[PDB]
Amino acid sequence: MDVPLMELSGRAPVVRLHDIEADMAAATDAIRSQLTGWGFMAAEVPGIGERVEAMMNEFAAACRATGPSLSDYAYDVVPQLAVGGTHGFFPYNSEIPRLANGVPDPKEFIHVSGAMIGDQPPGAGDVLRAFPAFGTRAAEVFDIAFRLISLFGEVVRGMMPPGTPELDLSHDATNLRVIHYRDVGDREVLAHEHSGIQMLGLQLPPSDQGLQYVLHDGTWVEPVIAGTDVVLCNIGRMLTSASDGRFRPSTHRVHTKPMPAGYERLSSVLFAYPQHKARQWKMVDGELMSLNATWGDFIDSR
């Protein structure tokens, strides 16, 4: 094969869900070595796999449901924050597909924001009431992922100059994306190489292999994560910008092998954002530079 597999199970630091602060402190030196040596980070979080599996299985069942219907909670009929991303269900349109940078996007997916979990703005929580088995599991996984990613953010901050502020990740602005790949046909690429626009991403263990990362030397590898308790932490383009380009974005892609007639591939990722209204900053020449432009401006810029 052109892309070697990358074993992480038994090889990334172990971070216990009931002991997250102390274990992440102990894991800091290894996580720094990963960001330095690889360009992305990884921890093994015992039991997370089964929590994420159950959550994604309830999402698959909600995608199939004939009443209530996920389609009744498309982003265009869900109350959206005045200043914010778009939360809610993103249906697959076969006729005029959503483009990922010009390429048809072979998935249906939901964005569960911290705002939505809190029913903000009012009515945003409706999908989580229509599909309570999914909704309760999505809130659980969001909260576990948010706690993990906030502490990955502290490791990265610790690698930056003194004076580097707290990343101040926004619960309400941060989104859990839950993905059901569909209408794949003969595709071997589900997602061409990209990086997130946000501060950090946390890849939760997917149903299937195929997610790939590029190393600093341009070598593509395939983390062994399907059926594991391994999470991956991604640098987004906001943290590339905040770090004055010190930390490149954790560029990745998703490939697949042919599977049965609409076999269900599932994946979930937390995209962590700072407050849209807060001013940008960059660590330039060893100390903090405040910008006039907001994180919200950073997103619009693209």
Footprint on this chain of Cl ion (rule: CB under 5 A): 196
Judged by CB, which is closer to Cl ion: 85, or 135?
A: 85
Q: Which is nearer to Cl ion, 135 or 250 (CB)?
A: 250
Cα(103)–Cα(101) distance, rounded to whole angstroms?
6
Q: Does the annotation flag 51 for ligand binding?
A: no
Phi, psi of 250 (to 5 degrees): -80, 70
**Phi first, then psi: what are they for 99, rounded to 5°?**
-100, 130
**What number of other Cβ atoms are within 10 A of residue 120's Cβ?**
17
Task: State yes or no: 137 annotated in a binding site.
Answer: no
| Least separation in angstroms between CB 252 and Cl ion | 7
Rg of the chain in Å (alpha carbons):
19
Is residue 276 a known part of a binding site? no
Query: Is residue 213 marked as binding?
Result: no
Q: Cβ of residue 195: shortest distance to Cl ion, in angstroms? A: 6
**Residue 267 marked ligand-binding:** yes
CB of 237 to Cl ion, least distance (A): 10
Shorter beta-carbon distance to Cl ion: residue 17 or 100? 100
Q: Minimum CB separation from Cl ion for residue 201, in Å? A: 5
How many Å apart are CA 55 and CA 69, to the nearest integer? 17
What's the min distance (Å) between Cβ of 288 and Cl ion? 27
Question: What is each CA distance from 262 to 180, 182, 239, 292, in whole angstroms?
Answer: 10, 7, 37, 48
The one-letter amino acid code at 122 reads P
Determine contact, residues 195/252, Cβ cutoff 8 Å: yes
Residue 253 annotated in ligand binding: no
Helix (H) or strand (E) segment spanning residue 148: helix 132-158
Q: Which is nearer to Cl ion, 135 or 196 (CB)?
A: 196
CB of 193 to Cl ion, least distance (A): 10
Give yes or no for a contact between 204 and 268, defined as CB atoms under 8 angstroms apart: yes
Decide: 254 and 191 in contact? Cβ < 8 Å. Answer: yes
Nearer to Cl ion, 39 or 196 (CB): 196
Name which of 198 and 280 has its Cβ closer to Cl ion: 198
* Min separation Cβ 194 and Cl ion, Å: 6
CA separation for the pair 164, 288 (Å, rounded): 7
229 backbone dihedrals φ, ψ, rounded to 5° = -100, 20
| Distance of alpha carbon 13 from alpha carbon 5, whole angstroms | 19
* Residue whose CB is less far from Cl ion, 196 or 206: 196
Residues paired with 279 in a beta bridge: 294
Residue with the shortest CB distance to Cl ion: 196
Annotated binding site for Fe(3+): 194, 252
Annotated binding site for Fe(2+): 194, 252
Annotated binding site for 2-oxoglutarate: 177, 181, 265, 267
